[PDB]
């Protein structure tokens, strides 16, 4: 998709291996924020959003929290508390035409900056001056979208790049998107090292009478530690009691 109309795919209820993605050397850019890729194939998320678009080389650096430019201001803006990874690779062999590929566009004029994760695909005439444009292009009335050249003989900074931005959200909910590994059986009334949808800790798992609502997946204590979890396979509530301890 064009960067001004960047496509978004919502990934849910599936199993993915990010380790194979990181293993692949097709990617020229792979910087993660708030989470490292080596520690990505053992964390479950509730939803994964895949934003994809095409920009040129020297604009790849603008896909990051707190960056400025035509793309980050008018086309695709990332929040400052962004948690995810930015992936890009040179797509000159696919997105370039001998006469120039004019299908990839970008927003050049806009009255203000985009909010984080906002998309603006309007084709209204940009009123640059004081006189209204009434949807008529011309003097002080610009078309807001400009097209990339994208020719094979272009410099690397002007060659097309395909960007995929994965953003991870930890909604307090049943984490469906997980990495790998099989599940195991659950042992009650014993001290175990548990992992429920990516949430780990140590404690004794027992039966409970805590009536979680259908939308609630985790409970918390005063200290913000996990109090109880809902088993992702059988929708029962299990209390987590830290393993027996005391002074000696």
């Amino acid at each position: 998709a064009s960067v001004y109309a960047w496509n978004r795919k919502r990934i849910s209820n599936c199993v993915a291996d990010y380790s194979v993605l990181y293993n692949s050397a097709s990617f020229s850019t792979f910087k993660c924020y708030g989470v490292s890729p080596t520690k990505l194939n053992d964390l479950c998320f509730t939803n994964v959003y895949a934003d994809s678009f095409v920009i040129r080389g020297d604009e790849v650096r603008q896909i990051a929290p707190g960056q400025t430019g035509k793309i980050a201001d008018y086309n695709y803006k990332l929040p400052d508390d962004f948690t995810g990874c930015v992936i890009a690779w040179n797509s000159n062999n696919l997105d370039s035409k001998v006469g120039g590929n004019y299908n990839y566009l970008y927003r050049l004029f806009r009255k203000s900056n985009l909010k984080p994760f906002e998309r603006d695909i309007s084709t209204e005439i940009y009123q640059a001056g004081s006189t209204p444009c009434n949807g008529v292009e011309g003097f002080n009335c610009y078309f807001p979208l400009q097209s990339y050249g994208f020719q094979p003989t272009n410099g690397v900074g002007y060659q097309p790049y395909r960007v995929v931005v994965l953003s991870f959200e930890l909604l307090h909910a049943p984490a469906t998107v997980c990495g790998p590994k099989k599940s195991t059986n659950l042992v009650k009334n014993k001290c175990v090292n548990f992992n429920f949808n990516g949430l780990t800790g140590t404690g004794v798992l027992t039966e409970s009478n805590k009536k979680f609502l259908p939308f609630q997946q985790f409970g918390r204590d005063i200290a913000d530690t996990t109090d109880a979890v809902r088993d992702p396979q059988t929708l029962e509530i299990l209390d987590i009691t830290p393993c027996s301890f005391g002074g000696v």
Partner: antibody
Amino acid sequence: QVQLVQSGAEVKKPGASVKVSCKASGYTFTGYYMHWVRQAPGQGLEWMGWINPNSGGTNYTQKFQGRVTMTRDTSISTAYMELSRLRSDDTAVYSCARDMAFSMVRGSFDYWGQGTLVTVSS
Amino acid sequence: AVLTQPPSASGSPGQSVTISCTGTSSDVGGYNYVSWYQQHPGKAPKLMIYEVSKRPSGVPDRFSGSKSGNTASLTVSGLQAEDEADYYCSSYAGSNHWVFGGGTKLTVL
């Protein structure tokens, strides 16, 4: 380096139509507005209109409305100007001039074509 | 609406000459988008001044533009033999239309 190469000279009779081409090179063709100007031999410059190679929008001055047609083909970076219902005093050298502003029309031309003489003889 | 331009301006070598360009309140006096072009015989016009007084790169400082009311002015100080050419003014005229001046021949006496 910007180059605007126009088609060859044309000889026409009154009532016919003519199509002038203007192939650009050395820059992103969609990035700059293209203007069309004609100049009668010995006389002055006359503005005809402009086209945006990006959006495709056009505007023509009043005296040429109904007879002029400006188009472009982005795949070959060529702009076209068509003038219909030709008359004797339409004999002039027609030129395509690139607007120097980037993705805006501001009426200042920094690159011109060599011109295309269109002769409407008796 | 044509821009009124004197037919002939002239001066001796080294002298200063001013070429006027009178429009109306809806083109010259309405917007600060007046331009000036220089055309030598048989060659394409060359932009010398745009936006009334801004000079493109490569244009000599001897060429200077200005505007007062509905009348613009192109001034050429230190006139030289190579400055002998035709000079056309231009201006936005509203309604997405630009207009030219009649043209002035500049002759080195």
